[PDB]
């Protein structure tokens, strides 16, 4: 988790953005994660 929170994800363009989304989100569909219920349940915090 320190290696996750360490990453310089800001100002990262090109195919390295795709690689970072593939690493930090291996299994989900990002388009399925965009809704608020998915962001509540995936990180296990209330939607409020």
């Amino acid at each position: 988790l320190y290696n996750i929170l360490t990453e310089d994800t800001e100002s990262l363009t090109g195919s390295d953005l795709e690689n970072s989304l593939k690493r930090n989100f291996p299994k989900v569909k990002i388009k399925d994660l965009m809704t608020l219920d998915a962001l509540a349940n995936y990180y296990e915090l209330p939607a409020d």
């Binding site: 608020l36 219920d37 939607a47 409020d48």
Partner: protein, 49 residues
């Protein structure tokens, strides 16, 4: 103990009736209007029209 599991199955049945808790929106098309602008007579005339 068994009566506490009874309590849990009753409250889960009630949650099954209610369903999914409705997320109240706050990011909204609600601008912050003027009270003069919010209480226009045209604003109710057009509505009921």
């Amino acid at each position: 103990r068994d009566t506490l599991n009874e309590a849990k199955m009753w409250y889960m049945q009630a949650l099954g009736l209610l369903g999914d808790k409705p997320v109240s929106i706050f990011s909204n098309g609600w601008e912050n209007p003027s009270l003069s602008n919010a209480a226009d007579k045209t604003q109710a005339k057009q509505f009921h029209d």
